Each structure stands twice: as structure tokens, then as C-alpha cells.
A = this chain, B = another copy of it.
Amino acid sequence: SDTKVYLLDGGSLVLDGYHVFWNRGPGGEVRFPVYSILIEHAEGRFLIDTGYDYDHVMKVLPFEKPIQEKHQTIPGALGLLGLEPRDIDVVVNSHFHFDHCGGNKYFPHAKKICHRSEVPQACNPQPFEHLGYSDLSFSAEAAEARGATAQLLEGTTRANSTFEGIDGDVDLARGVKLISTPGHSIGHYSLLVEFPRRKPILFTIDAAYTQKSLETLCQAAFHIDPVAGVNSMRKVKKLAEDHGAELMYSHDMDNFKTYRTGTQFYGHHHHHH
């Protein structure tokens, strides 16, 4: 049971270049991918993030012009792998912006994990965080707090949408580490996956939308604390250098086109060793 990582292509959204590169831009529409990270591990199947819900975006953020085919929903992407939501044991959310938790609703059976601060933030966000924390279907508690119980999928209860809260740099499983990278959101996590026979991969998630972002220390305009945001970028750069990790970014179309998705995966076996 060697560690494998499968990227679940979740389609795309659009933001202004001023959203993507805070203050710098240039301005104008930029379309970027959204994906989730499925880890097939000895300890179980872990899904980090769950993309966006198409209907939610069309209702609440239609200016983000979602494109998402049937195979780019979470059930659809899992289907490419001959899996279904019930095959996933643990769901981890990097943060509860709508584009990272829109598929949580399909995983009532799963254990849920997130930073200790994130459910409380979803319940009572800053005034400027309402569009980010706009989809409360991942939490009956948060939906109730926000007056958004109408968003709840039938069958979602407090009992099946409670999160175990974590803090700091901690192990999710053997060789899978959650790296605290606050700034974009109060409890934002990045992800370091180690493999038995290859160098690690550091998924920046929303601590760095693109390669350019991390190079230039220019974060996204969506953030709660930009000082933290930069410090977290430095932390990520240093961690990658230390571990000799390969960096992969959350919302970077040019790089994403070069990433393995669908039935392609990271963590291959040897063939002559």
C-alpha cells in the first residue's frame, strides 16, 4: 500500500487579474483551475478539499463564470477512478472558501478534519469574507449560524458534518503533513505528501495561487492577514527547498495543464527494482 496521489480536476472559475495578483494585476479576466487532492494511503483514502459546487457559484458568484463538466464534480472525478464518495475515509479542508468545500456534502460517512479556527470563521466571518465563506453546505453548524440551512443537502446533520480541529504543523497520516499557512484565511493549510520512493510534493493550495505568486511574494487579494500571507509564502519556499519538494499550485492554469489528473497519478512503483 504505497502512497499515491490523484488530482481530481474540478473545472475552472474566473477572477480579475487584480484578484489573483493583489494590487499588481494586470487587470482583466483570468481563468484558473480548481482541483482536489485524493491520497490513496495505507491508512485509508484521504481527500484534501472538495472543489466548488456549480449551482452555488451560478447562484451566488456567477461573475466567476464556472465551467465544470459532469466528470469534474467530485462524484464524477471519483468515477473516473472507479470510486464513489463512500470510498473516501477522511476529508480534510484547507479552508472553507466555497471553492474548496463545495463537495463536502457527499461525504457524511467520512471523518472531517480542518484547522480549529475555520468552522468558527465560517460561522462568523469578517465582513469582507462573506463571498469566500459563501457555501455552508459542508457544516450544519455553520449553515445554522449563517442563516443558510436552505443550502444543506438532505441528510446533512451536525453529527455527520462535525470537524476535528487541528493546529500547527501536524501529520495527517504517515508521511502526509499538513503545513500551517495562514493569511489567505485564518486557518489555511498547505499539504506536504511524502512517498516511499520519490521526492515529496508540496501543494501550496491557496497560500500561493500560482508559481508567479510564490516567486514574487504577491499573494491573492482574498486574504484576512496579508502579513501572515507573506510569512506563509516564505515558510513554503523554505520548506520546499529543505525537503527538495516539488511545488504544485492551486489556481494556475499554465502549470495545471502539465499536472497529472484523472487516471494519471503520482507515486509510481519501480519496474526493475
Is B224 touching A227 in the complex (CB atoms < 8 A)? yes
Knowing A16-B27, A27-B16, A27-B27, the reply to whether A22 touches B227 (Cβ < 8 A) is no
- Is chain A's binding surface mostly helix, strand, loop or mixed? loop
Judge whether A6 is part of the interface by a CB distance below 8 angstroms. no
Contacts of A218 in B (CB 8 A): 128
Task: State the oligomeric state as a number of copies.
Answer: 2
Judge whether A256 is part of the interface by a CB distance below 8 angstroms. no
Is B128 touching A217 in the complex (CB atoms < 8 A)? yes
Is B128 touching A230 in the complex (CB atoms < 8 A)? yes
Which chain B residue lies CB-closest to A228?
B225
Is A221 touching B23 in the complex (CB atoms < 8 A)? yes
Range, interface on chain A:
20 to 34
A141 to B226, CA, bound (A): 26
Is B224 touching A221 in the complex (CB atoms < 8 A)? no
Find the residue from A25, A127, A218 having the highest chain B CB count within 10 A.
A127
Contacts of A209 in B (CB 8 A): none
Is B126 touching A230 in the complex (CB atoms < 8 A)? yes
Judge whether A96 is part of the interface by a CB distance below 8 angstroms. no
A72 to B126, CA, bound (A): 39
Knowing A27-B27, A225-B225, the reply to whether A230 touches B19 (Cβ < 8 A) is no
Interface residues of A (CB under 8 A from B): 16, 18-19, 22-23, 25, 27-28, 126-128, 131, 217-219, 221-227, 230
